[PDB]
């Protein structure tokens, strides 16, 4: 992908003025240096390869941190709701555009540590992860019958092995993902006081993407241990169709509300370089 | 040349002699649905000129300390005759829009205005509770609303207003106003021109949607330079707005709807 070269130009004398225009039409004059000053012949070699969206999104970033324990009887299993709104690093970049379409990739990291080695020592550990589509039953215990996963995909990871990795396709029910929605899920009709038609502004579908569940398989050691899990995400094969200006104030809730940080610009003189 | 244009339909007539060039959003012209991209199966209806005509909205006053105005579509047109009637009987609908703003003044006046068009134009609330705004206040009709110069939280927890509180320099969504020129826009300067025109197609993630629940396009107006005149007492001038849709069709006919209002 080359770039246009610059040709030579000399002096001029006329009333052919391309430097005058009107912005009221909402158009920009495509001016170039050669039309107002003398130039020498030059040949360019620079390119715009590092400006593509695919290279703009070719980075992994953290999304969530999870905690879990292992003990005889404090919580033995946990759940997390899937969403990209919990962090600002990727959210700010994604809010550059209105609609998007891409595949997705996943990766997991595991860590563990003692609380006290006074009671004894424990063997290696094994961790379990399962995926719960919307509408599926929720486990009620660390030893529930629901962990059989006869249809729900699940992954097993061994402590000390390299991280796992997963890929999934586009799974939207519409033709593309939507980052904004100016409307309601319900319409309030007559003959209904408070409880019918009441819905939150900007609400999404009844259930978006479900959640994930985690537990440890090994039986309780005579002493307590602690562990954590981290998640990283990586898009690929991206497309976008509409731009927007970026955020400039601290986020507050999933919506566009704001209640603080309303003075980002400092003072300065008018005639200071 | 481009200083003169003609646009007039349906037994009305107006005078125009100083319009600038026209604008098309992303260079796309409205069209009907193609057979290779439909999703329903029933035969639709096409009112044609029964709904594709110019409608006139309420008038407003521009003052020295005015802040701005904002409207929503297709909410504003729900009460305009056959278009509104069809919008309530059928479950699904689709349409484009056309806009035209009218404003005139003398030579010794000076000032400037900006016009912006925004799809999926969300706004902030006014209370601690997240996303607590109510339906009846976010769909007020033709009158629209106005921006505020500052942010203030409510205290009547027993009877909350559950209303918006946009800020002009934040554009009502926590972003700088100067960067909004990435949207389609036109600028009116009283010394050069007296009107604006725009063309808007249907933009959404789906070929068709429910018109009662989701609003596609929003419109905002912000003064950039304050109005002034040698008159030291006071001065006011009117603003009038016109809208006209094109390429209408609907599906899913049943009994009528009657939304709740307060």
């Amino acid at each position: 992908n080359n770039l246009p070269d610059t040709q030579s130009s000399g002096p001029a004398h006329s009333k052919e003025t391309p430097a005058l225009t009107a912005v009221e039409t909402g158009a920009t004059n495509p001016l170039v240096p050669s039309d107002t000053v003398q130039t020498r012949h030059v040949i360019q070699k620079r390119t715009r390869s590092e400006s593509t969206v695919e290279s703009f999104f070719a980075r992994g970033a953290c999304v969530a941190i999870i905690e879990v324990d292992n003990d005889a009887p404090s919580k033995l299993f946990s759940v997390w709701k899937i969403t990209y709104k919990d962090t600002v690093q990727l959210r700010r970049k994604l809010e550059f555009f209105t609609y998007s379409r891409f595949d997705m990739e996943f990766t997991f990291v595991v860590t563990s540590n003692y609380t006290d080695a006074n009671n004894g020592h424990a063997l290696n550990q094994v961790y379990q992860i399962m995926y719960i589509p919307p509408g599926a039953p929720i486990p009620g215990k660390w030893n529930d019958y629901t962990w059989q996963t006869s249809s729900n995909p699940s992954v097993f990871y061994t402590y000390g092995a390299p991280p796992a990795r997963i890929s999934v396709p586009y799974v939207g029910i519409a033709n593309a993902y939507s980052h904004f929605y100016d409307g309601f899920a319900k319409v309030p009709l007559a003959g209904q006081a408070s409880t019918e038609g009441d819905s939150l502004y900007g609400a999404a579908s009844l259930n978006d993407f479900g959640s994930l569940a985690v537990r440890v398989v090994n039986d309780h050691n005579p002493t307590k241990l602690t562990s954590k899990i981290r998640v990283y995400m990586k898009p690929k094969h991206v497309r976008v169709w509409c731009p927007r200006p970026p955020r400039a104030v601290p986020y507050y809730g999933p919506g566009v509300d704001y209640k603080d940080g309303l003075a980002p610009l400092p003072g300065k003189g008018l005639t200071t370089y | 040349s481009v200083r003169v244009m003609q646009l007039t339909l349906g037994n009305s007539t107006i005078t125009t002699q100083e319009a600038a060039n026209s604008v098309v959003a992303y260079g796309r012209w409205p069209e009907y649905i193609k057979d290779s991209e439909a999703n329903p199966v029933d035969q639709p209806t096409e009112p044609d000129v029964a709904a594709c005509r110019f409608y006139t909205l309420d008038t407003v006053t521009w003052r020295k300390e005015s802040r701005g105005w904002w409207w929503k579509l297709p909410d504003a047109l729900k009460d305009m005759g056959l278009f509104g009637q069809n919008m309530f009987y059928h479950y699904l609908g689709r349409a484009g829009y056309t806009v035209h703003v009218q404003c005139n003044a003398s030579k010794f006046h000076q000032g400037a205005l900006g016009v912006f068009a925004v799809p999926e134009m969300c706004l902030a609330g006014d209370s601690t509770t997240h996303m607590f705004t109510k339906y009846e206040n976010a769909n007020p009709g033709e009158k629209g609303g106005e921006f505020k110069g500052s942010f203030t939280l409510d205290t009547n927890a027993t009877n909350p207003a559950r209303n918006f509180c946009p800020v002009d320099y934040l554009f009502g969504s926590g972003v700088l106003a100067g960067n909004a020129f990435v949207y389609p826009h036109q600028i009116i300067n009283l010394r050069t021109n007296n009107c604006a025109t725009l063309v808007l197609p249907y933009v959404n993630s789906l070929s068709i949607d429910s018109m009662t629940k989701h609003n596609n396009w929003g419109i905002a107006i912000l003064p950039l330079a304050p109005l002034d005149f040698a008159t030291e007492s006071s001065t006011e001038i009117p603003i009038t707005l016109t809208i006209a849709p094109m390429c209408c069709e609907f599906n899913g006919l049943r009994n009528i709807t009657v939304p709740r209002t307060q």
């Epitope: 919580k75 919990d86 809730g253 | -």
Partner: antibody, heavy 132, light 110 residues
């Protein structure tokens, strides 16, 4: 297993200051996976929540909006106790009071952490009376 | 202020099945499954029965169970017995860092 205990004056006069202290047995107040709440019950009004406090690498507080400025809660590391303070006492304050514990639910995140739906351990209930 | 709604009172005979519902505004129940239940007896402090819609702590019989999402949460009981008579209250936790309780349900026998 872990059990609570209630203490403090049972009678109050209008315009005075009321303070109560609850004692923990078998657990540590600085626990990083627990929370402590104050509740009062009255037949005319039923159950209602006042405030809470917890320690996560630092001390923190949470108070109800309606009585935010009238309430103050302070801990006591040495006693393994936490104390309540209420001002502008009035006849309406005559009701039963408990100290309780909260356990963590499992959906995690939001503002980084987990959610504490409710309570599992309850005290005996200490009565406070306003007269004269 | 939005407040939760409960039926005034219900009674039955041993061996039957019982259903109770708690309902309120959207801001209180429609967000997520942040729902819990408590029980009380004459002269007794409240006791937990159910947390998180359907999770039964230790010592809770399989008879008491109920679940739903949206604008209403339902509690269902099977194998009804005399000792099951008690007072019932629904609870919720909102995004505004607040806790709410319903008007309560009154069931008592001398």
């Amino acid at each position: 297993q872990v059990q609570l205990q209630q203490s403090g004056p049972g009678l109050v006069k209008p315009s005075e200051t009321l303070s109560l202290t609850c004692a923990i047995s078998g657990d540590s107040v600085s626990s990083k996976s627990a929370a402590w709440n104050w509740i009062r019950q009255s037949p005319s009004r039923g159950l209602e929540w006042l405030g809470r406090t917890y320690y996560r690498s630092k001390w923190s507080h949470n108070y109800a909006v309606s009585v935010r400025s009238r309430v103050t809660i302070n801990p006591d590391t040495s006693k393994n106790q936490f104390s309540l303070h209420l001002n502008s006492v009035t006849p309406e304050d005559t009701a039963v009071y408990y100290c309780t514990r909260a356990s963590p639910s499992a959906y995690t995140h939001g503002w980084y952490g987990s959610y504490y739906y409710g309570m599992d351990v309850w005290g005996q209930g200490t009565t406070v009376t306003v007269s004269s | 202020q939005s407040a939760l709604t409960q039926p005034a009172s219900v009674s039955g005979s041993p061996g039957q099945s019982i259903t109770i519902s708690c309902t309120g505004s959207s801001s209180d129940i429609s967000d997520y499954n942040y729902v819990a239940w408590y029980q009380q007896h004459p002269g007794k402090a409240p006791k937990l029965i159910i947390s998180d819609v359907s999770i039964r702590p230790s010592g809770v019989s399989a008879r008491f169970s109920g679940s739903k999402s949206g604008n209403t949460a339902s509690l269902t009981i099977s194998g009804l017995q005399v000792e099951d008579e008690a007072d019932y209250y629904c609870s919720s936790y909102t995004s505004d860092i607040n806790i709410l309780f319903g008007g309560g349900t009154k069931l008592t026998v001398l």
